[PDB]
Paper text:
In addition, to have a complete structural view and to compare the [name] structures from M. tuberculosis, [name], and M. abscessus, we have also solved the crystal structure of Ami1Msm at a high resolution. Ami1Mab shares 68% and 65% primary sequence identity with Ami1Msm and Ami1Mtb, respectively, while Ami1Msm and Ami1Mtb possess 79% identity. [name] (Ami1Msm), containing an amidase_3 domain, is dispensable for bacterial growth but [name] deletion mutants present an atypical lateral branching and a defect in cell separation and septal PG turnover. This mutant is also more susceptible to antibiotics due to increased cell wall permeability; a phenotype subsequently confirmed in an independent study which also reported the attenuation of the virulence the [name] mutant in a mouse model of infection. While cell division was impaired in the ami1Msm knockout strain, this phenotype could be rescued by complementation with the orthologue gene, Rv3717, from M. tuberculosis (ami1Mtb), suggesting a similar mode of action in both species. Furthermore, ami1Msm has also been shown to be important for biofilm formation. In [name], deletion of [name] increases type 3-3 crosslinks as compared to the WT strain.
PG remodeling is performed by numerous autolysins acting on specific substrates and at different stages during bacterial growth. While glycosidases, such as muraminidases and glucosaminidases act to hydrolyze the glycosidic bonds between the carbohydrate units, peptidases, such as N-acetylmuramyl-l-alanine amidases, l,d-endopeptidases, d,l-endopeptidases, l,d-carboxypeptidases, and dd-carboxypeptidases, hydrolyze the amide bonds of the peptide stem at specific positions. Ami1Mab and Ami1Msm displayed an overall globular structure comprising a central β-sheet (β1, 4, 5, 6, 7, 8) surrounded by strands β2 and β3 forming an antiparallel β-sheet, six α-helices, and one 310 helix (η1). The catalytic zinc is coordinated by the highly-conserved triad which constitutes the amidase_3 motif signature, namely H25, E60, and H115 in Ami1Mab and H51, E86, and H141 in Ami1Msm.
Author numbering: 37 to 254
Write the structure that this text describes.
């Protein structure tokens, strides 16, 4: 898509490369409650961690966006130390007033279920959540599915998953979606996630979703 160079994308590779006791501290959810600052994240049965999958996949997304002239910033800068709380990741995104926010995750579900789901804030708390973020979720879902990655068989509908319990989505004031790429407990998704080429496969599809949404906003 044209007229996307110079637009701003905030990238959030879920979880931290290391955790301490401060991840249990309570932070606001955006709907009047609190939850833990951070969670360790899930892992494959044999211990490949979500935080490394999201980190490396996000680096691949960033490189492709840079090649398109798209500005990026990331919520964390390594995969071996503490990272920001879930409310802080939303605050970092909001401080940038970006055109798009993508948080990248991997899920833990029943081992026979595989595929992606795209989460978005619902019920919406502001205009970005009510309109553009819903459109972004659909474009992202379409591009993941067009890439041959099946929509999740075990949660959501057709790969879309309206959610009220994600602090980073609730607190965003700019277009924002969270991509659960697959189920780390499933043999196919875990094998893809453990491979550099599989992580590139997820990244390429996410980039198509981002670029398609950015182009639609122009
Ligand atoms: Zn996660």
């Amino acid at each position: 898509p044209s007229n996307i160079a110079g637009m701003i994308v905030f990238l959030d590779p879920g979880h931290n490369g290391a955790n301490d006791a401060s991840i249990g501290r309570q932070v606001p959810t955006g709907r009047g409650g609190t939850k833990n600052c951070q969670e360790s994240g899930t892992a494959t049965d044999d211990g490949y961690p979500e935080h490394s999958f999201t980190w490396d996949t996000t680096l691949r997304v960033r490189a492709a966006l840079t090649a398109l002239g798209v500005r990026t910033a990331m919520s964390r800068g390594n995969d071996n130390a503490l990272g920001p709380c879930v409310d802080e990741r939303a605050a970092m995104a909001n401080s940038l007033r970006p055109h798009a926010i993508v948080s990248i995750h991997a899920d833990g579900g029943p081992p026979t279920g595989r595929g992606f789901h795209v989460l978005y804030s619902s019920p919406p708390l502001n205009a970005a959540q009510s309109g553009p973020s819903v459109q972004f979720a659909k474009v992202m879902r379409d591009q993941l599915a067009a890439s041959g990655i099946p929509p999740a068989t075990y949660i959501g509908q057709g790969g879309l998953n309206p959610r009220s319990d994600i602090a980073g989505l609730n607190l965003a004031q700019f277009p924002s979606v969270l991509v659960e790429c697959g189920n780390m407990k499933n043999p196919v998704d875990s094998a893809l996630m453990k491979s550099p080429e599989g992580r590139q496969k997820y990244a390429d599809a996410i980039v198509r979703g981002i670029a398609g949404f950015l182009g639609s906003q122009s």
